[PDB]
Amino acid sequence: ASMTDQQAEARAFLSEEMIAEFKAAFDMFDADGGGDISTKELGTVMRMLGQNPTKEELDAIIEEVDEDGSGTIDFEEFLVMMVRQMKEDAKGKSEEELANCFRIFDKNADGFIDIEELGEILRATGEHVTEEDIEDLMKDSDKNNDGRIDFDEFLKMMEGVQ
């Protein structure tokens, strides 16, 4: 992926109204109307738009985009950086939520989901699940054949591909 390839993929990931919303905030720091902002303002615009880069991440980005020393980042490069951050933050949110889901499923807090806990959570959804359906999910998710689902197997069960 060239930079332009990365920029075309960044644009394809976002709806056009979202792109124009991001440009409306970006434009408030341009002033000069040139299609770019100081790299000193990148963190501010990113956080205004709901992203949370660390300082180390921002330094890494600035160094990626400011090799000519102009001290600016353009809008197309800004979109590439926003999509990278959106993907990273969403990944972190999903892992955090899966760890909370496991702590709820594991009613007895022993570090495993057993067939009784699994049957009880699935029946409470209201779905017409049978004991055979519950046993089939258990057997398919239980990689090491100990009769239970630990957090590593839970992550694989839920994420599915993984």
Binding site for Ca ion (CB under 5 A): 106, 108, 110, 112, 142, 144, 146
Question: Is 145 labelled a binding residue?
Answer: no
Question: Is 94 labelled a binding residue?
Answer: no
Among residues 78 and 154, whose Cβ is nearest to Ca ion?
154
Nearest C-alpha neighbor of 112 from the set 158, 75, 149, 153: 149
Closest approach, Cβ 36 to Ca ion, in A, equals: 53
Question: Is 38 labelled a binding residue?
Answer: no
- Kindly write down the DSSP assignment for every residue of 22-84, as one continuous string: HHHHHHTTT-S-SSEEEGGGHHHHHHHTT----HHHHHHHHHHH-TTS--EEEHHHHHHHHHH
**What is the torsion angle, in degrees rounded to the nearest 10, for the CA atoms of residue 97, residue 99, residue 101 and residue 104?**
-140
Among residues 11 and 156, whose Cβ is nearest to Ca ion?
156
Question: Is 114 labelled a binding residue?
Answer: no
Among residues 93 and 103, whose Cβ is nearest to Ca ion?
103
- How far apart are the C-alpha atoms of 64 and 4, rounded to whole Å? 14
- SS3 breakdown of the chain: % helix, strand, coil, rounded to 5? 65, 5, 30
φ, ψ for residue 85 (rounded to 5)? -65, -40
Closest approach, Cβ 93 to Ca ion, in A, equals: 25
Among residues 77 and 106, whose Cβ is nearest to Ca ion?
106
Among residues 15 and 144, whose Cβ is nearest to Ca ion?
144
Question: Is 27 labelled a binding residue?
Answer: no
Instruction: Indicate the annotated binding residues for Ca(2+).
Output: 30, 32, 36, 41, 66, 68, 70, 72, 77, 106, 108, 110, 117, 142, 144, 146, 148, 153
Instruction: Indicate the annotated binding residues.
Output: 30, 32, 36, 41, 66, 68, 70, 72, 77, 106, 108, 110, 117, 142, 144, 146, 148, 153
